[PDB]
Design an enzyme around this catalytic site. Structure first.
Site, mmCIF file in Angstrom:
data_model
loop_
_atom_site.group_PDB
_atom_site.id
_atom_site.type_symbol
_atom_site.label_atom_id
_atom_site.label_comp_id
_atom_site.label_asym_id
_atom_site.label_seq_id
_atom_site.Cartn_x
_atom_site.Cartn_y
_atom_site.Cartn_z
ATOM 1 N N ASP A 1 -44.840 33.492 17.076
ATOM 2 C CA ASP A 1 -44.532 32.106 16.757
ATOM 3 C C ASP A 1 -43.230 31.671 17.425
ATOM 4 O OD1 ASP A 1 -42.980 33.754 14.827
ATOM 5 O OD2 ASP A 1 -42.380 31.797 14.033
ATOM 6 N N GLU B 1 -47.808 30.704 20.031
ATOM 7 C CA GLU B 1 -47.681 29.270 19.772
ATOM 8 C C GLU B 1 -46.424 28.752 20.458
ATOM 9 O OE1 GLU B 1 -45.237 27.960 16.839
ATOM 10 O OE2 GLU B 1 -45.163 26.493 18.470
#
Lengths: 599, 606
Positions: free
Chosen positions: B304, B342
């Protein structure tokens, strides 16, 4: 169901002699099972790292006969654990009586001793020795016991003892060269105070941490067995240690205690079946899990009395009855300081059921006689000669234990009179007579050099004295005596038939002549207890012909003057000492001659 | 000698990707080895019950490369331990950075966390799964990720989550029933703050105590594999927890954080960010990635906030090179693992191989798609006319990377509202729209991710302190949505036309019915083709014609408006025969009835 219903039924009977199979802490790969006896408990809980030492995490469930049990997942070997028992208003943390190993969390036994979960898995290689052990048959075989305190024997550095394993090869090396038959180990069971020598016991089922893990000890015994040496374990069923977390007031009330002047309130209540299980199972525990060959019970008189304690007497009788049933070739030895009859006699004849008794009467008389000066020994001749009236009352072991070389009593060496030569001569003479006297032999470590100092457990024995002549000679004398013992069966039979007097009335010259016999074989023992050589001293003998000098204490190799007959002694057929033939000998100073007919 | 001289040199190069073999606590049969990295420490000591917590009892010895190691007899598994590091005048207690298990003595993770010696022996039963794990080839296979927070899923009792073991069979049964291929677990690495959801990490090598032991987690991962489920773990190389005994100023200096003061403050992560310049930091992180795939057989790791690594505000080359070699070592040692990123910027080649100047991830979250789609359907059907271009232009960006269409926990939090809450109209229409959203997402190119609780359309934002509103599965509208997702995943798992997310896998049928807000497209692999007709308005449409490439009998494989999903029951009813009339520039055409707020998926008949 952790406990069989037979187990609970056997526990109430006091017949659970394998009780260690179920009581205490028993590891499983996922978790450990816990079993403790606490009848007057309202609750019992296991505390440990495995539950943040939280008392409500793992509360054992009460089963029959005050037997509590529970399972703890994640409780692992080598972890320390503890029991929390609640007696109404008050709760207390206690150690496991059936703990198989203990270690000090602080690092000092005197502060904290902690039960540690243990696996006793060990693969033995002592197969050969135990298929041939004797014991009850050892009554007619040489038993020469080397009594030992492991911590005091040898040190790697000052104040640092040998591990169980590290000691194995040195002790086995030493014991074999000496010719000793067994090692008797001062109590190995876990004890808080090192200065106790082990007689104040906390962990009856745990070998002491000081020398290593439990397997380390099993390896030591395994090793010694392969080397052909026996292991006797001193055992203390008479009293337990005064440790608050220990056996004292276990369930919050009297449990192992009576519901003795020596140890009041620390005496086991032999009335309770639960006590009887704990004690006798532990006896078997050592014979089973550690392959121990013999167990020695001290201060048996303290159990017999308080007038006789019958609780204890039935207990001792059942202890001996049980041992020989499960281990037919074990040996049990007793020290009893009163004239209690039939210690060594079988229970079926109203005896206590022991195989052996320490001849403490002999030791006292013998030591008192030799504490005396040869000039004065004249007036105490009866103390020396009369030992044989009481010498066959029991199956006896002649004893020279640690208890005689402590508390200002003086080393055996220190006890003997005169200058150094006479001191060495006296001790060589003493042992010679002890090896000749009927009964097995026990000598405490350091007696084999005749060390100067009293046994100090906080140090290692004075091996440096083995460099000097007088002490090296005594070590040689004991080895050679041990050779004579094992080689000749005339000494194996401590029966009245085995011993015959040759002469006992030479009080003026302080001499003793006696015969030790089995069938064909004879061994003639002539003892001069004065520093005066005796010449033309005739000694009657049964057989005529050539006689040999098998041993002479006064040989220069032992530190002696060297006066000797040196073999080649021919019997003369003139009656002496009411005997058909006589030997004309030279009696060396403060020495023993051992002679047999030539063959 | 605990450390090989090869061990010291590999650590110095920052190439020691098995470093967990030697750093941390490794139980021996009679004791424990301890090894810690503290280059600027003058002394390092191990403290524990196994030495009565005495700092001079066991002083580790300095080896090269700033690594300290030492042996302690009697230190055993389940013991709590501590490092005492002396930085000149000052001394401090620290936890093991390589701790493989942590537990709080207090029993509250926030109040304290402790390093506990653990042995990781575990016997696996996942042979069939890992010999058949397709990893990179999964791009050509159906991947449907069920995103999960283990503590939040179900509670065994109120306010009490399921253990790693206890969750296994209930969750695997659920994930199997709904047909998802993998579960993505929000970070399980030890974290003090439960409310952090695991993204503030203290113990990178330790699964969180909250649900059980390491082996407890191994049973779950093993279990899910035996049930045919893949496990993707969320991994946080961007930052470590701001926790004082943790990695912050470990040796008494900046160590895991950037030495430079200007570098040390980063706007998203403040003072704590990993100094990717340090070879030791590179070891710790990349060893940790392989550690999870090695000892826990995890099928994937999802990174992330990649943008926070790439930029400092601009490019951080330290982070970019670390990212690249992270991906290279992963696929080198575990060729069938999966790595997902991401990134909130339009950074190119996230999903591309490093040898093509990509970052080396296998998958990228299509957050463009998510925002676009959500922005469009958040709006009212009367207005959807004016935002038609937001819907259709989503495919101009759908092939730029290997993409996973993701609706996540971050979307259903912080006043953003549930997916259900996001959709317009009353409950019937809200449920209809949610069926449409899932309908299009399964139709749109890319793999699929849905966060827990979205599959029934739960009302409230995801609250970590509670368990999902499963009681809504009693009410029809939500039980219908869950059935729709199950049928969608079954279609996805069985039809290879949906597996190929390349531009070849998609053909537009028609996109310019902007007025009525209808779109038709084709998902085709080889001969096989699936037709998607979507009505984003509550009025049904009758005699609506849709061009087709092939003429013949066509069957309707799925109808969002089917009564089983909570719908009108409106539909073609099958036996649709293409009419040999040209429409939408196609040779044949289908005359269809479009149900309200509904998705149709149609297949030619064989």
């Amino acid at each position: 169901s952790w406990l069989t219903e037979e187990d609970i039924r056997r526990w109430e009977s006091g017949t659970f002699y394998d009780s260690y199979r179920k009581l205490g802490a028993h590891p499983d790969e996922e978790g450990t099972w816990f079993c403790v006896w606490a009848p007057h408990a309202d609750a019992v809980s296991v505390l440990g790292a495995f539950n943040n030492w939280d008392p409500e995490a793992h509360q054992l469930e009460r089963y029959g006969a005050g037997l509590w049990a529970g399972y703890v997942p994640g409780a692992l070997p080598g972890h320390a654990y503890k029991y929390r028992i609640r007696h109404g208003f008050y709760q207390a943390d206690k150690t496991d009586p059936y703990a198989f190993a203990m270690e000090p969390p602080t690092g000092s036994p005197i502060e904290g001793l902690a039960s540690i979960i243990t696996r006793l898995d060990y693969t033995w290689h002592d197969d050969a020795w135990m298929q041939r052990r004797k014991g009850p048959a050892s009554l007619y075989e040489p038993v020469s016991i080397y009594e030992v305190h492991l911590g005091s024997w040898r040190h790697k550095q000052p104040g640092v003892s040998f591990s169980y394993r590290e000691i194995a090869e040195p002790l086995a090396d030493y014991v074999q060269d000496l010719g000793f038959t067994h090692v008797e180990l001062l109590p190995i069971m876990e004890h808080p105070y090192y200065g106790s020598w082990g007689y104040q016991v906390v962990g009856y089922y745990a070998p002491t941490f000081r020398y290593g893990t439990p397997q380390d000890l099993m390896y030591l015994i395994d090793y010694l067995h392969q080397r052909g040496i026996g292991v006797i374990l001193d055992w203390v069923p008479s009293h337990f240690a005064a440790d608050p977390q220990g056996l004292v007031y276990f369930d919050g009330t009297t449990l192992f205690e009576y519901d003795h002047p020596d140890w009041g309130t620390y005496v086991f209540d032999y009335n309770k079946p639960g006590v009887r299980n704990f004690l006798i199972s532990n006896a078997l525990f050592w014979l089973d899990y550690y392959h121990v060959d013999g167990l020695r019970v001290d201060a048996v008189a303290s159990m017999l009395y308080r007038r006789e304690n019958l609780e204890a007497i039935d207990f001792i009788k059942k202890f001996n009855e049980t041992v020989y049933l499960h281990f037919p070739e074990a040996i049990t030895i007793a020290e009893e300081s009163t004239a209690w009859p039939g210690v060594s006699a079988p229970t079926y004849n109203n005896g206590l059921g022991f195989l052996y008794k320490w001849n403490m009467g002999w030791m006292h008389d013998t030591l008192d006689y030799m504490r005396r000066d040869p000039v004065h020994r004249k007036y105490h001749h009866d103390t020396l000669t009369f030992s044989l009236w009481y010498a066959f009352s029991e199956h006896y072991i002649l004893p020279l234990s640690h208890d005689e070389v402590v508390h200002g009593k003086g080393s055996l060496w220190t006890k003997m009179p005169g200058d150094d030569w006479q001191k060495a001569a006296n001790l060589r003479l003493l042992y010679g007579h002890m090896w000749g006297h009927p009964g097995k032999k026990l000598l405490f470590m350091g007696g084999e050099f005749g060390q100067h100092h009293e046994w100090n457990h906080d140090t290692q024995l004075e091996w440096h004295l083995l460099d000097q002549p007088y002490h090296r000679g005594i070590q040689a004398w004991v080895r050679d005596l041990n050779h004579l013992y094992r080689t000749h069966p005339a000494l194996w039979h401590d029966g009245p038939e085995g011993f015959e007097w040759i002469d006992f009335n030479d009080r003026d010259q302080s001499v003793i002549c006696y015969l030790r016999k089995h069938t064909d074989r004879l061994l003639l023992f002539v003892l001069n207890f004065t520093p005066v050589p005796r010449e033309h001293y005739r000694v009657g003998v049964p057989i005529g012909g050539p006689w040999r000098e098998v041993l002479n204490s006064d040989a220069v190799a032992y530190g002696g003057s060297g006066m000797g007959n040196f073999g080649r002694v021919e019997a003369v057929p003139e009656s002496w000492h009411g005997r058909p033939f006589h030997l004309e000998l030279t009696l060396p100073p403060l020495a023993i001659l051992i002679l047999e007919p030539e063959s």
